[PDB]
Design an enzyme around this catalytic site. Structure first.
Site, short mmCIF file in Angstrom:
data_model
loop_
_atom_site.label_atom_id
_atom_site.label_comp_id
_atom_site.label_asym_id
_atom_site.label_seq_id
_atom_site.Cartn_x
_atom_site.Cartn_y
_atom_site.Cartn_z
N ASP A 67 0.77 -1.71 0.12
CA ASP A 67 -0.01 0.37 -0.27
C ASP A 67 0.57 1.04 -0.05
OD1 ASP A 67 -1.85 2.33 0.66
OD2 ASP A 67 -2.50 0.71 2.03
N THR A 91 4.32 5.36 4.59
CA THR A 91 3.33 6.32 4.49
C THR A 91 4.81 6.85 5.33
OG1 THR A 91 2.37 8.04 5.45
CG2 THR A 91 2.91 6.11 6.44
N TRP A 120 8.15 5.64 -1.81
CA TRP A 120 8.33 4.65 -2.42
C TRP A 120 9.84 4.54 -3.76
CZ3 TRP A 120 10.46 6.75 -7.50
CH2 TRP A 120 9.00 7.77 -7.62
N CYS A 264 -13.27 22.32 -2.99
CA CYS A 264 -13.20 20.66 -3.82
C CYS A 264 -14.55 19.85 -4.02
CB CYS A 264 -12.64 20.05 -3.09
SG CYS A 264 -10.85 20.70 -2.81
#
Ligand SMILES: [Cl-]
Length: 282
Positions: A67, A91, A120, A264
Site C-alpha cells: 500500500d 507513508t 516509494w 473541492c
C-alpha cells in the site's frame, strides 16, 4: 514572496489525528468514498471504496500487498480482515505511520504486517500486488516516470496495480463539456497553490505514463460525484464539530479546512475535477 524574519505559523498540516477525527469516518479514510448503494453511511462507503480497489487486484492467499501512501490505515485494515495476504504499508507522515502501526497491530492475522515510514523511491521489496489510494496527487510530475518504473520493477510477471488519484481536464475538454471556470474558481486554485505545489494530471496523462513503463491500462473507473458527496459529509461533520475544532486549533484553521472541503466539493459537483481508479497490469 519570502519574508525576512522566520515566523513560526499555524498550518493546516500541523493538526493532530484528533482534529481529523472531527470530520472523517471512524476508519479515518481521507480519500473519495464509494457509495455503491445510495443509502450507505460514510463508513460503509469508505469500506466499499477500499473493497472495490482490493478486489481488482486478484489477491490470492500468501501474496504480499504493498500500500503506497497508506494514510490512517483503513485500506490495510480491510486487506488484513478480508484476504489471507501479507501486507506492507508505507507513508511519509509520522503521525500516520504511528497511527497505522498501532491500528493494524490490534488485528488478528496469520500473515506478516509491516508499516514503514518510507517513500516509494526508497522501496525495493518484491511484492505481488500494489494499491495506492490518494498518494499520487502529492507527487511532482517530474517523478511520474520513476514512480511507474519502480512500481513495474517490484511486481512479478502477473503483477497488478490499482492506482486511485484525482484528475483534471484540459480547457478544450471543459469548453466541450460546457464547464465554465469562473474568477471564484481561479481564486480557489490560488488558495490550493498557497496552502497545499504542482498541477493535476488528466486521465490521458496516467495512460501515457503507465504505458511508457510497460503497464497496460485495463480499466479506469471514475467516481466524480462520489467525491462531491464525500466532501459534503466531511464539511458537514466539521461544521457540527466547529467549537471543538476551534478549541483544538483556531477559527483561522477551522475556516481554512472548511474552505478547502467545500471548494473541492464544488469543483467535483461542477465537473472541473474527477477521481479515477486505474487498473494496471504487467
Ligand atoms: Cl489539533
Amino acid at each position: 514572496e519570502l519574508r525576512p524574519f522566520y515566523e513560526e505559523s499555524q498550518s493546516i498540516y500541523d493538526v493532530s489525528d484528533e482534529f481529523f477525527s472531527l470530520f472523517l469516518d471512524p476508519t479515518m479514510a481521507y480519500t473519495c468514498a464509494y457509495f455503491e448503494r445510495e443509502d450507505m453511511t460514510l463508513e460503509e462507503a469508505q469500506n466499499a471504496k477500499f473493497d472495490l480497489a482490493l478486489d481488482k487486484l486478484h489477491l490470492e492467499p500468501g501474496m504480499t500487498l504493498l500500500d503506497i501512501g497508506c494514510g490512517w490505515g483503513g485500506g490495510l485494515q480491510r486487506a488484513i480482515e478480508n484476504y489471507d495476504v501479507n501486507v506492507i504499508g508505507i507513508t511519509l507522515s509520522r503521525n500516520q505511520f504511528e497511527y497505522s502501526k498501532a491500528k493494524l497491530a490490534k488485528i488478528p492475522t496469520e500473515r506478516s504486517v509491516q508499516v514503514r515510514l518510507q517513500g516509494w523511491d526508497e522501496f525495493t521489496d518484491k511484492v505481488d500486488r500494489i494499491v495506492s489510494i490518494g498518494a499520487f496527487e502529492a507527487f511532482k510530475m517530474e517523478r511520474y516516470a520513476a514512480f511507474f518504473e519502480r512500481s513495474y520493477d517490484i511486481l512479478p510477471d502477473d503483477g497488478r496495480m490499482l492506482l486511485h488519484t484525482i484528475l483534471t481536464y484540459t480547457q478544450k475538454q471543459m469548453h466541450e463539456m460546457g464547464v465554465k471556470v469562473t474568477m471564484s474558481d481561479v481564486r480557489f486554485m490560488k488558495f490550493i497553490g498557497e496552502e497545499i505545489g504542482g498541477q493535476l494530471p488528466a486521465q490521458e496523462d496516467i495512460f501515457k505514463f503507465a504505458q511508457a513503463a510497460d503497464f497496460s491500462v485495463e480499466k479506469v473507473q471514475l467516481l466524480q460525484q462520489h467525491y462531491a458527496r464525500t466532501l459534503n459529509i466531511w464539511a458537514a461533520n466539521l461544521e457540527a464539530n466547529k467549537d471543538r475544532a476551534i478549541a483544538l486549533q483556531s477559527e483561522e484553521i477551522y475556516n481554512k479546512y472548511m474552505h478547502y472541503l467545500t471548494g473541492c466539493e464544488h469543483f467535483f459537483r461542477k465537473g472541473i475535477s474527477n477521481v479515477g481508479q486505474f487498473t494496471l497490469t504487467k
